[PDB]
Design a protein around this ligand. Structure first.
Ligand SMILES: Nc1ncnc2c1ncn2[C@@H]1O[C@H](COP(=O)(O)OP(=O)(O)O)[C@@H](O)[C@H]1O
Ligand SMILES: Nc1ncnc2c1ncn2[C@@H]1O[C@H](COP(=O)(O)OP(=O)(O)O)[C@@H](O)[C@H]1O
Ligand SMILES: [Zn+2]
Ligand SMILES: [Zn+2]
Ligand SMILES: [Zn+2]
Lengths: 637, 408, 281, 380
């Protein structure tokens, strides 16, 4: 038959299960696999099948749009009963593969087809009962990963009252199947699984958590159990961000009907395909922006527009947002690619609300308070698995912020042990742990932005930095940029700040309507920033994703002499622990400056601005009597 | 049909000749003289002797290994009768080992080869190997060699039989925990553990922290919807190319070898030649000596980096952890005495308390890298005193006390 | 064979259908709105329910709500078939009723066994919450001896297998195969609340209670919120009654313990000039 | 990428099976150990360091000469054909370029003949390229962001196989051989080719080979190969075509918009079908909700104007009623929500409408605009 499956006599399951309809759609699927219209590209699926047989793998990726275009209702059936369609489509793929490479079943039992580019995406919080048993595509962050264990797939039973063997039953991962009548005895006697004639499968369970920047206000993070089957194991590890496509099914049957009041179950997602990306229209506008002369100043002015002044802090914030190059030189050596910033100053200097801009600007940001954090909580926590009862580990805030930024407010007032827990994370970008027999190291590739208050609550300008804070030289050495702020009084500066703040409070006050309100919002953004903020976010993401400037030794002296000058001026004064780690800060911040221009090379101008920032940061932290001398000692730079 | 398999095993034992000697017959005779009822069969000789029985064993050993046991027992009894219990099969092999992470639902009931480190061992358990039973209703007796008692009498009601304890035999069994080498585990992953079981002469041969090579059968047992716990029937445990030997001997013959290796330690760092050479000495390590009173001299070299921050002190340890063949890296803050050293924990798979090794136990025979050492607690330091100076770890938890060695 | 009928329930259903047909037809507009926007639950103002037959209908419905609810559900589904049959379509007649705007609000202090099976409204500060789950509202089973199917097996507060095979040619009992496709489910959530500060006098400790929410009303309760609930009190089995003094009744041996929980259908959180001003006389 | 080595495969009986096997599966292959490669390296060095292009030559309607481009990039292009009927009088002015061209041609003519014998089943065209009948285009970029291009020749030859993308090619010691549109067209389905991406500022010289351009594209068509090359150059170089071929440029450009609107309709069908099957009711959703998903499927930004362009061609496509919110909506017009046969029928109806409108536009005597005007929904 053909086109006769379009008749809607009843719900889709009542029609698909009919053997004639199944044969018709299997023939249609075979036609789709054998021939597809990709013009100059020929039938790409044939080449895919041939190369899969060549590569000895089971993954036949199928573009949803292709099948939808070629066969209208054939894709819609998969969109509402994915399991039933895949059940026969696996056999169709298997025979198609055996056409090119015979005896494929001699090694591979089945073909695990994977769906790609499914056009409907739901969050982990948007799932509803109306989408039960349907195909869904969700995006989340891997938090906890269980082991890989075998699980039954086709089960046969042995009757106790006869030597006959019961027929095969498919394990849907829904319930521990227990038959009630023997096919020969018709008795309700005991049954036992015939293991020697039973086919298994691999099983793994992974929890997907809401992305750190996507948690709604005032609610705990949502998460679901995701089941990885059919060689889909080890596709992700804790800290990774993935998007997965699967089936929304219910399998928590058992004592829950009596332990908790009334009969209830719990939902899981059984994963079909998983994936761990820019259109031309976005790259064109990015490249239009990149060619503007002096783009660096616009970017710097774009950070936290409503905060007046503090340009020497805004530049550091922007540089940390863009970051540098994590040069894993020759593999055997590594350098952290991210810039660490400390905001130290008097109260009433917005050392905290800047972090409330990094949290809203960076792709993935984690915020914590000094006394509201624990060493176990930040790094990693130990858990016992509810299924396997084994010791398991769950990542903390630093593991969550992997390939992101971690924020710690009131960094000075946290207890010493929680502060010590940050030592390894600040340089190794990793968490090393040994608890309950678990020995492992997680990736913690994140930058740290810290805000703190000086000893006594007010900065003593007459005393060095190494005396105004309760911190120590080790901890200070893990930073790159130190921003010291004085709340000194002056009529002109105070008038400027007040007239900026009052207009900021006038702006932020409330007062195709969607388009009109977006236009008005962008008008207000233009009134205060040179770059639209959504474009800035996309630009930052694109720069972090694509641009990796390289270095040249054209200006070796200009950096070496600056390093020597700083070391000489730090020889006998209480000041920053200037070391090789601080030398690397110049290079990394120069790389960050270059990455704003999207240039592939580190230029002399970038190094000039880098040297300016580092030298100014070092100088502005010395005592008053020496500051006015070092002002003139470094007049060259 | 299986009589041919038994005959083939009999030929492979009695008549197989290597190095102009009946090596298998002679070794089985020597074991009988020693009264060790076990035979160490080498798979590399078995494949060379007969390929068909090797194919059967590789594909369906389920009936082959009972045949192995009974044939070896019969042949050994014949040899004992000629010269004047069930003999255990031990397999030695050198074929390629499948990685532990690659074990899947396809290798069910197949004999595989593995390598790893032992992290925990259970206490011995007594299992039945031959039983004689009597019916309580009519005193009828019979013998039985998973096994379960008959439901009806052979002469009485359901379940009439009881076990005659004074006319039965039992054997020992031990449960083992294997995991992959942490050096082969990429960061961001906890090494996979694996349950193994051994019986009779294969028990008590390893302790936690031991690195072994395994020949065994991949199988599952019931203890999640259908998550059947996998376990390994242990069959044989074992614990450089000639051109590589020549290359490394020439490297030793290099007149500038010491300086070359000194520069080779973290070449991407400048100077620090003294600490570089000290770390080289740590990597080589000292030589063990034993006093005539039985005490052992600790040959490990322990070095404390106690300088100003930012002097590449962490980078050196992170580089050594790459270089040393056995290396463990952990922070002082994120570790504990129960984690750094051994601990006693209950195994949920066998419902028994297990002695489990710690991080420093895993680093036995290697080097451990620890950072922020000043920030660990004093109890951990006290345990590390024993680990450093006596190469032992003393455990006194719950109601059990034990001492475990650690050459870290 | 004719089953026993509740004539009072039939009168209540008829009065409820007449109320739906005659009230002004804002509720029929609500039904159409649900059809347009694909909505599962209809909402009824209690003061609208209490303005027909001098509110005697509302009183009768409230005081035995757990009994009369099926009749109102039948009336509403008959009405929706009369006017919006497309809501019976799936891809199969899941439908909920939620009453709101109760006149009286009762404290956790004033919980009594007399209130069981009656409509009432309570308020309390939320302290702990559990994640949402699916609940088996109505299940269906297929026979094991033969292959007959049994639909509309309502699971009243317990896992309930069918008591017989409908065809007399089969002798199946105590064994069934559960369907997970033709069966339908609903959302489930439990809210653990605390007595408010202004209720407890000085020197008195606050009372705690567990509240049950189902359907789309879930997740509208947040910790620290002075939420308000509307529904009926229901008792649930309890295991902590063991060891208490006094004679305990027995069934014949079986146990018959109980503890009290509140089931709420409507959720609201207590908290723009004209919006506030239009709510005042 | 397959590699051909003259030290082991240099004979016709050796090359022909290898070339046929490569072309039955690939469109690009490499040449190794060619004797002139050592001289080719020195000639390339001389061109890129001493023999700079003659920037004063200018550019003509024949797409030959030294065309200035954006970012001060210069393009030196020459065309040669054995048939005198085409006036390619602008021969190459530089002797080093001719030295590279001759050394390329000496083996490239034989390789093109081998490819034609391998994949072209037409016995009348087995020797369509030879010393007596051949046409070549010499191309040289110069600098005083990859560009996608598709040669129309039988074979394309590059003296250096570096920085070329399709995955990148990094084989400097091998020459790159790429098949064009004509060879695949005459292959009768036995061989296909794909466009390449190259750096326009890399100063790379390239050669492409055709039979004499007066040869028709096929016996089934009236236009010649020169017409196809002219179409390709007009599409590639609008600035040059403006002086000489404006109307042809507009006609050629409108086809891209036609394909765009067709694929937009194809995407919208799937989007609306999935929206309809995800609801128990047929209420039309607001357009602004559908737009992100539509743009994601299209893999480029889609706006309301592009949607309204569809209504211009096929009025019976969708129902576009405006919601009480003031937000535009769209829905399927069919009462019984969908049928695959009716879906194909509606797609074919839109295709027919688009083709008829394209023919109407190109038949007009007025100058053609290259974009479909947008429909206006009646304001309420
Ligand atoms: N430089 C500034 N420009 C504008 N507003 C500022 C500035 N510094 C502080 N403020 C205002 O003062 C408040 C400071 O908040 P907070 O960041 O907690 O101060 P700090 O962290 O410095 O103690 C902010 O709400 C901000 O509006
Ligand atoms: N001699 C050196 N050569 C190269 N890099 C060095 C040298 N000394 C220090 N460094 C730099 O210092 C960093 C290591 O600092 P580290 O020892 O981790 O700080 P801390 O002592 O606070 O742990 C590395 O990034 C490395 O590049
Ligand atoms: Zn039976
Ligand atoms: Zn008996
Ligand atoms: Zn029945």
């Amino acid at each position: 038959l053909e086109s006769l499956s379009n008749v809607k006599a009843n719900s889709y399951s009542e029609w698909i299960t009919q053997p004639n309809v199944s044969r018709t759609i299997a023939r249609e699927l075979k036609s789709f696999l054998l021939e597809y219209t990709d013009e100059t590209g020929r039938s790409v699926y044939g080449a895919r099948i041939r190369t899969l047989g060549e590569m000895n793998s089971e993954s036949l990726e199928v573009n949803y749009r292709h099948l939808a275009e070629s066969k209208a209702i054939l894709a819609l059936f998969l969109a509402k009963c994915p399991e039933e369609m895949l059940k026969i489509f696996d056999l169709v793929a298997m025979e198609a593969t055996e056409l090119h490479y015979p005896d494929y079943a001699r090694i591979h039992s089945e073909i695990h087809v994977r769906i790609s580019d499914f056009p409907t995406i739901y969050s982990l919080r948007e799932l509803r009962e109306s989408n039960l048993s349907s195909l869904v595509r969700v995006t989340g962050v891997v938090t906890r990963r269980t082991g890989v264990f075998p699980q039954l797939k086709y089960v046969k039973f042995n009757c106790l009252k006869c030597g006959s063997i019961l027929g095969p039953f498919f394990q849907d991962s829904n319930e521990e199947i227990r038959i009630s009548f023997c096919t020969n005895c018709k008795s309700k006697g005991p049954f036992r699984v015939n293991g020697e004639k039973t086919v298994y499968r691999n099983y793994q369970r992974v929890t997907l958590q809401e992305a750190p920047g996507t948690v709604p206000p005032g609610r705990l993070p949502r998460h679901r159990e995701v089941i990885l089957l059919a060689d889909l194991v080890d596709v992700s590890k804790p800290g990774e961000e993935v998007e997965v496509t699967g089936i929304y099914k219910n399998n928590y049957d058992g004592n829950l009907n009596a332990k908790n009041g009334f009969p209830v179950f719990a939902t899981i997602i059984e994963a079909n395909s998983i994936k761990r990306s820019w259109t031309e229209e976005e790259e064109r506008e990015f490249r239009k922006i990149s060619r503007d002369r002096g783009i660096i100043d616009k970017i710097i002015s774009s950070m936290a527009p409503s905060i007046y002044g503090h340009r020497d802090i805004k530049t550091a914030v922007a540089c940390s947002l863009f970051g540098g190059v994590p040069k894993n030189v020759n593999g055997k050596h590594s350098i952290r690619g991210d810039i660490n910033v400390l905001l130290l100053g008097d109260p009433g200097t917005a050392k905290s609300q800047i972090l409330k801009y990094v949290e809203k600007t960076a792709h993935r940001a984690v915020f914590a308070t000094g006394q509201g954090a624990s060493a176990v909580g930040l790094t990693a926590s130990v858990r016992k698995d509810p299924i396997t009862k084994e010791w398991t580990l769950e990542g903390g805030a630093l593991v969550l912020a992997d390939k992101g930024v971690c924020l710690i407010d009131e960094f000075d007032k946290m207890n010493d042990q929680d502060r010590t827990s940050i030592h390894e994370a600040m340089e190794q970008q990793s968490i090393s742990i040994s608890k309950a027999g678990i020995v492992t190291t997680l990736q913690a590739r994140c930058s740290i932005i810290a805000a703190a208050n000086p000893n006594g609550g007010r900065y003593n300008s007459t005393l060095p930095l190494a005396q105004n804070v309760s911190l120590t030289e080790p901890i200070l050495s893990r930073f790159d940029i130190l921003c010291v702020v004085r709340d000194l009084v002056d009529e002109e500066a105070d008038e400027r700040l007040a007239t900026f703040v009052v207009d900021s409070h006038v702006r932020s006050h409330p007062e195709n309507a969607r388009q009109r309100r977006l236009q008005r919002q962008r008008k207000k953004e233009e009134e205060i920033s040179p770059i639209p903020q959504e474009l800035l976010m996309k630009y930052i993401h694109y720069a972090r994703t694509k641009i990796y400037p390289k270095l040249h030794q054209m200006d070796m002296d200009k950096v070496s002499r600056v390093y020597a000058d700083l070391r000489r001026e730090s020889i006998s004064t209480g000041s920053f622990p200037i070391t090789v780690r601080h030398l690397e800060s110049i290079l990394r911040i120069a790389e960050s400056f270059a990455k704003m221009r999207l240039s592939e090379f580190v230029s002399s101008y970038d190094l000039d601005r880098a040297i300016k920032v580092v030298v100014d940061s070092f100088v502005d932290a010395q005592k008053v009597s020496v500051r006015r001398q070092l002002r003139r000692s470094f007049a060259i730079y | 049909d299986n009589t041919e398999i038994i005959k083939s095993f009999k030929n492979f034992i009695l008549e197989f000749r290597l190095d102009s000697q009946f090596i298998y017959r002679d070794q089985l005779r020597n074991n009988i003289l020693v009264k060790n009822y076990s035979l160490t069969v080498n798979m590399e000789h078995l494949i060379g002797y007969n390929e068909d029985i090797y194919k059967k064993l590789s594909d369906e050993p389920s009936d082959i290994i009972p045949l192995f046991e009974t044939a070896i027992t019969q042949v050994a009894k014949r040899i004992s009768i000629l010269s004047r219990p069930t003999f255990q099969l031990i397999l030695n092999s050198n074929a390629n080992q499948i990685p532990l992470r690659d074990l899947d639902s396809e290798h069910v009931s197949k004999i595989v080869r593995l390598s790893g480190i032992i992290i925990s061992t259970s206490v011995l358990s007594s299992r039945a190997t031959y039983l004689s039973i009597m019916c309580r209703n009519c005193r009828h007796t019979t013998s039985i060699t998973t096994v379960s008692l008959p439901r009806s009498c052979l002469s009485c009601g359901p379940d009439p039989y009881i076990i005659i304890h004074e006319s039965s035999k039992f054997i020992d069994q031990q449960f083992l925990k294997l995991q992959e080498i942490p050096e082969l585990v990429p960061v961001g992953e906890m090494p996979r553990n694996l349950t193994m079981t051994c019986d009779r002469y294969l028990t008590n041969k390893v302790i936690p922290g031991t690195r072994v090579t395994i020949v065994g059968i991949y199988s599952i047992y019931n203890s999640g919807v259908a998550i059947r716990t996998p376990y390994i029937k242990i069959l044989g445990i074992q614990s450089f190319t000639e051109e590589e030997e020549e290359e490394f001997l020439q490297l030793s013959r290099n007149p500038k070898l010491y300086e070359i290796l000194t520069n080779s330690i973290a070449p991407s760092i400048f100077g620090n030649e003294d600490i570089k050479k000290a770390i080289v000495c740590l990597l080589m390590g000292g030589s063990k000596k034993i006093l005539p009173d039985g005490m052992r001299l600790r040959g490990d070299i322990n070095v404390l980096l106690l300088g100003d921050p930012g002097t590449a002190k962490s980078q050196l340890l992170k580089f050594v952890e790459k270089v040393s063949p056995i290396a463990v890296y952990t922070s002082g803050k994120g570790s504990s005495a129960a984690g750094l050293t051994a601990s006693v924990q209950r195994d949920p798979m066998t419902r028994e308390f297990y002695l489990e090794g710690g991080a420093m136990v895993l680093a036995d025979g290697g080097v451990v890298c620890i950072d922020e050492f000043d920030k660990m607690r004093d109890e951990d330091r006290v345990a590390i005193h024993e680990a450093m100076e006596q190469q032992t770890i003393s455990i006194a938890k719950a109601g059990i006390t034990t001492v475990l060695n650690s050459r870290t | 064979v004719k089953k026993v009928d509740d004539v009072t329930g039939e009168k209540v259903r008829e009065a409820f259908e007449q109320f739906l047909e005659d009230f002004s037809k804002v509720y029929r507009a609500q039904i159409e709105f649900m059809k347009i926007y694909d909505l599962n639950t209809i909402y009824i103002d209690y003061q609208h329910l209490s303005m027909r037959e001098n509110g005697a209908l509302a009183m009768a419905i409230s005081e035995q709500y757990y009994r009369f609810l099926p009749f109102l559900q039948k009336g509403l589904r008959r009405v929706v078939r009369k006017y919006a049959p497309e809501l019976l379509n799936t891809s199969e007649r899941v439908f909920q009723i939620s009453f709101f705007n109760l006149p009286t609000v009762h404290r956790i202090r004033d919980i009594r066994s007399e209130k069981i099976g009656s409509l009432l409204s309570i308020s309390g500060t939320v302290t702990r919450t559990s994640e949402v789950r699916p609940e088996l509202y109505k299940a269906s089973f297929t026979c094991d001896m033969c292959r007959a199917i049994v639909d509309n097996v309502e699971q009243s507060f317990k896992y309930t297998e069918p008591t017989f095979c409908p065809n007399p040619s089969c002798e199946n009992r105590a064994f069934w195969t559960l369907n997970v496709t033709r069966s339908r489910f609903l959302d489930w959530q439990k809210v653990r609340i605390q007595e408010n500060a202004n209720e407890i006098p000085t020197g008195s400790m606050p009372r705690t209670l567990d509240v049950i929410l189902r359907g789309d009303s879930v997740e509208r309760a947040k910790p620290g919120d002075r939420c308000k609930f509307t529904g009926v009190e229901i008792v649930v089995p309890d295991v902590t009654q063991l060891g208490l003094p006094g004679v305990k009744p027995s069934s014949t041996v079986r146990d018959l313990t109980y503890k009290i929980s509140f089931l709420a259908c409507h959720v609201i959180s207590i908290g723009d000039q004209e919006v506030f001003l239009n709510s005042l006389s | 990428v397959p590699v051909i080595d003259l030290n082991r495969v240099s004979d016709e009986e050796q090359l022909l099976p290898v070339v046929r096997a490569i072309l039955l599966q690939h469109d690009t292959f490499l040449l190794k150990n060619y004797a002139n490669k050592a001289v080719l390296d020195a000639l390339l060095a001389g061109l890129t360091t001493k023999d700079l292009p003659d920037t004063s030559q200018g550019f003509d309607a024949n797409f030959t000469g030294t065309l200035p481009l954006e970012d001060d990039v210069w393009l030196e292009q020459y065309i040669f054909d054995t048939d005198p009927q085409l006036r390619f009088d602008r021969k190459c002015r530089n002797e080093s370029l001719c030295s590279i061209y001759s050394r390329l041609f000496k083996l490239g003519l034989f390789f093109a003949q081998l490819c034609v014998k391998s994949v072209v089943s037409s016995a009348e065209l087995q020797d369509c390229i030879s010393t007596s009948h051949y046409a070549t285009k010499l191309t040289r970029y110069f600098n005083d962001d990859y560009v996608t291009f598709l040669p129309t020749g039988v074979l394309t030859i590059f003296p250096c196989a570096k920085a070329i993308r399709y995955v990148s090619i990094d084989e400097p010691d091998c020459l790159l051989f790429h098949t064009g549109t004509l060879l695949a067209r005459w292959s009768q389905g036995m061989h296909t080719t794909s466009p390449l991406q190259i750096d326009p500022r890399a100063n790379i010289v390239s050669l492409t080979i055709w039979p004499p351009l007066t040869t028709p594209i096929s016996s089934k068509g009236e236009g010649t190969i020169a017409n196809h090359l002219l179409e390709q150059q007009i599409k590639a170089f609008p600035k040059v075509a403006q002086q000489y071929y404006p109307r042809e440029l507009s006609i050629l450009r409108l086809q891209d918009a036609m394909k765009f609107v067709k694929e937009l309709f194809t995407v919208c069908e799937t989007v609306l079908s999935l929206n309809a099957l995800s609801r128990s009711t047929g209420v039309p959703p607001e357009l602004h909700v559908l737009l992100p998903q539509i743009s994601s499927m299209m893999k480029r930004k889609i706006v309301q104007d592009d949607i309204l362009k569809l209504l211009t061609i096929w009025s019976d496509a969708y129902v576009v009623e405006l919601n009480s919110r003031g937000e535009l909506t769209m829905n399927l017009p069919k009462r019984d929500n969908l049928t695959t046969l009716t879906n194909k029928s509606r797609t074919l109806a839109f295709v027919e409408r688009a083709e008829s409108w394209y023919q109407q536009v190109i038949a007009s005597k007025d100058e053609i605009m290259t974009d479909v005007p947008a429909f206006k929904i009646n304001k309420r």
